[PDB]
């Protein structure tokens, strides 16, 4: 009944070495610890993913290439562009082993859920949902979300993947495009030129998986109330049509006001309402992180959401801890939205919802 928290000091230190989010894992854990939330969770040390586990999704050739350039951090290997390495996904020294640790952490969370150790298991350093079977993508090297879902498939007949990251969860949607055992639901920014460029409302999966992918394309500037209205409407319909047995929930904080991507205009309170809606289903739930490039705000967000999971109200004041000065000059947990416009028009949102309802009738 007590949530599982996937953590070790060695794991956090590996996650701190990811090129686009240095030190973020330490900031997140440190703030959770500062609020003493870890004392209310069951701390579980992650196992490292084996090659055999990784190869149930990723190809041998891709895993072999990642292992090779990882050994010394060869970010100048001529073959890396075929495998998606380059600017977004540099060959950081050690990245194969770091990604294997994150994959293993998500698999460990899934296994805890299978065993009935907990109803909620958390890996805030997971959520790297853009990686493809044979390609790094979008700061993702191994798709730990896919690996977690594939572990959950041992027991849970139907799995719902819910993505609330700013970016379309395209690697997970692709992996399960042709199956009805896994439904993917993604709320994300959709605008030509905006990464990864996929996930329109008309993208519904393929073959035997047709209508088992759901995409909610959203424009810049969305705030908590409207986002929750959308999320609740879609998940209400999804729950009734698909009857999931387990949920994997990706809560990337790059939607939050203050992110340098400056696209959505959310606060952790809005995301928290979405999370509460899912938690009241009382299903095995695997919680993942993802994007989030204002590091202090990402720690504020995931710490707040950890409190939501535990049913706790957190003090507004940021407690003293290793990274206290990163939270100045006001040192509070709450985040204020920016004063810019919401570009989501009510008629468009309604039509997207009606389109999705129409698709789900087939499910």
């Amino acid at each position: 009944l007590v949530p599982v928290y996937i953590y070790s000091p060695e794991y956090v230190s590996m996650c701190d070495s990811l090129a686009k989010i240095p030190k973020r894992a330490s900031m997140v854990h440190s703030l959770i610890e500062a609020y003493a939330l870890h004392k209310q969770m069951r701390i579980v040390k992650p196992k490292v993913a084996s090659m055999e586990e990784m190869a149930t999704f990723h190809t041998d050739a891709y895993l072999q290439h990642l292992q090779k350039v990882s050994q010394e951090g060869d970010d100048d290997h001529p073959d890396s562009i075929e495998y998606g390495l380059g600017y977004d996904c540099p060959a950081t020294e050690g990245i194969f082993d770091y990604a294997a640790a994150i994959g293993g952490a998500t698999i460990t969370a899934a296994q805890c859920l299978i065993d009935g150790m907990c109803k909620v298991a958390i890996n805030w350093s997971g959520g790297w949902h853009h990686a493809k079977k044979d390609e790094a993508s979008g700061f993702c090297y191994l798709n730990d979300a896919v690996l977690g879902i594939l572990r959950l498939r041992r027991k849970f007949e139907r799995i719902l993947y819910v993505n609330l990251d700013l970016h379309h969860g395209d690697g997970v949607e692709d992996a399960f495009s042709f199956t009805s055992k896994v439904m993917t639901v993604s709320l994300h920014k959709f605008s030509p030129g905006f990464f990864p460029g996929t996930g329109d409302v008309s993208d519904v999966g393929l073959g035997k998986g047709r209508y088992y992918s759901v995409n909610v394309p959203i424009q810049d500037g969305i705030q908590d109330e409207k986002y929750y209205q959308i999320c609740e409407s879609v998940l209400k319909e999804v729950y009734q049509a698909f009857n999931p047995k387990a949920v994997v929930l990706q809560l990337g904080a790059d939607t939050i006001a203050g992110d340098p991507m400056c696209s959505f205009n959310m606060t952790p309170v809005g995301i928290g309402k979405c999370l509460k809606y899912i938690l009241q289903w009382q299903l095995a739930t695997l919680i993942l992180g993802g994007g989030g490039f204002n590091l202090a705000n990402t720690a504020r967000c995931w710490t707040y959401l950890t409190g939501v999971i535990l049913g706790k109200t957190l003090s507004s004041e940021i407690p003293d801890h290793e990274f206290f000065t990163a939270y100045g000059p006001d040192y509070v947990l709450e985040i204020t939205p920016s004063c810019r416009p919401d570009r989501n028009e009510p008629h468009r949102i309604q039509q997207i919802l009606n389109y999705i309802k129409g698709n789900l009738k087939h499910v």
């Binding site: 600017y87 993508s137 700061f139 030129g193 990464f195 990864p196």
Partner: peptide, 5 residues
């Protein structure tokens, strides 16, 4: 391919 980032 798109750039993220």
């Amino acid at each position: 391919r798109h750039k993220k980032x």
